[PDB]
Structure formats: C-alpha cells, structure tokens
Symmetry: C2
Subunit: 153 residues, 2 copies
Amino acid sequence: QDLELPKLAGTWHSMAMATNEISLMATLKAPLRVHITSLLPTPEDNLEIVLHRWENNSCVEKKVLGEKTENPKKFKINYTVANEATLLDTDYDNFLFLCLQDTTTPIQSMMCQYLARVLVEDDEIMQGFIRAFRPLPRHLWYLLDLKQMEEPC
Amino acid sequence: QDLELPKLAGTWHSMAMATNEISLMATLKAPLRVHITSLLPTPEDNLEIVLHRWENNSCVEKKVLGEKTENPKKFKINYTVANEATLLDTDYDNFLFLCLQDTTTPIQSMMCQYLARVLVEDDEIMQGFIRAFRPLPRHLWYLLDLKQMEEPC
C-alpha cells in the first residue's frame, strides 16, 4: 500500500476514538475531543482536514491544514496540542485510522480516530483499530465507542 | 446457559474494563478502578469476589461478598458506589464479563470487566465484550485496554 492520497478525499464519519492520555479526550472541552468529517487532499499533496467539535456551548466546524512531509502518511499541523497528523491505515472505501499527535514530548501524546465512509459497525475493523494502537504504543489506552447522533456534533 | 456457579471458581485476570461514566474509572483513586483476581462461590450460592486496587500509594487486596438474588447472574453487594454485581456472560474456561453497578440512580452507572483465565488476547471475545455493553446501554462507553504488568496492581 503506497498511499494514494486522492482516494481518501471526501466525507468520513467517526466510529471510535482512542487516546493514551484520557484528558485529551474525556470532556467535550478536551483538546482532541473532535470529529473529523472530511478530508480534502490538495494538488500540492497537502491535506485539508475538516472537523467538528463542541466549543462555547455549540457545535462548530474547524479547518486544519496539513503540510506534506517526506513521509506520505505524515503531515505537519497546528491544532491545540497536536503538531502532526498521521494516516495510519486505510482501505479507502470503508475505513481510515487517523491520528493527531504531539511529537514534542518524550512520550508522544496522541488521539487516533476510526473513521468510516458509512455508518456500519464492523468487527474486523474495530478489532484492527485496537490492534493498531496496541503493539509499540505499549501503555494503557482509552477507547471511546461512539453512538449515532448522541454526540452533539 | 443456565449459570453453573461452581465453574466460575478460581483465578481470573482483567484484560479490559468499560464504563459509561469515565470518572468511575479514569484514575487509580477512582471508585471502580479495580481488578478482579478471583471468584469463590459459596455453598449457599453466594459469591466471594477478590479484587486488587491502588489505595494510599500501594497495591491492596479487597474482599467483596455478594448475596444471591432470584436472578442467578445478579448479586447484592456494597463496594464504593456499586450495590450490585452481574455475571453478564461467560464460557467458564476462557472468559467472564462481570459488571459492578449502581442501580440507585435512574441512569445506571456501571463498570464491566473482561476477565480471562489466562493472559491471551482474543479478537472474538474482545469484540464480544464491546458488543455486550453496546445494545441497550446506548450511551457513549469508555473502554480501558490494559497491558501486562504496566498497571501496578
């Protein structure tokens, strides 16, 4: 899988979220309590991320630009505590695991999101999501399993 | 599956934990941040639960007695906020899903633990654990995926 960026374009839905620092995600106010709703790769092979979150007592939409790196899965960003986004794994038509990371610390703080093209629970993929953040990131991991229009934004 | 209580006797290891209230579980001080290490059914068909937790800056062992109810999966207890324990599902030789619940509130607060006889990651069972707390408990659920001798107790 050499990453074909254009094939990630378009709408995505968050199915689950994981973090190695619960406070990044535990509340609606938390830095990385966000929901990625679309990706828009640019002609320069940069990445536009669109996300939704709760902020000042309402649902709001944010744009986050990512500059390409030597690694086609990694983009430099600036969103709250995160300075890097990672396209961890994908099959394009069904799932994408996308991480927002703070690389500045010795222990890299991180939130990864299981994104899906349609709202369909899949055991293989949910289990692959868990397996993804398992191996080398060998701390306790928290996982938030989302529900349908229960999360406000 | 009519529940054969004696077949649950003995040693268990926590593989994962889930809650519908993150604060019950988020810190080591949290009420239901506990690890069940054995079950000992009594001759009266009551249940002795042994658990381990962090408390006053060290690992400590606790005993929690459960009185039988008309339901053979449910036992009345008194541990922090929980007044009931539930044996949700099991195959006896590999897994047991055990919940500690506060039934006193309208929205039942709850921590469930994926217990295992041996330290073996299994996709089918981990996925069955998630499916278990999914259907009717239809809020956001948090899941803590544990690691080997990283958790102090």
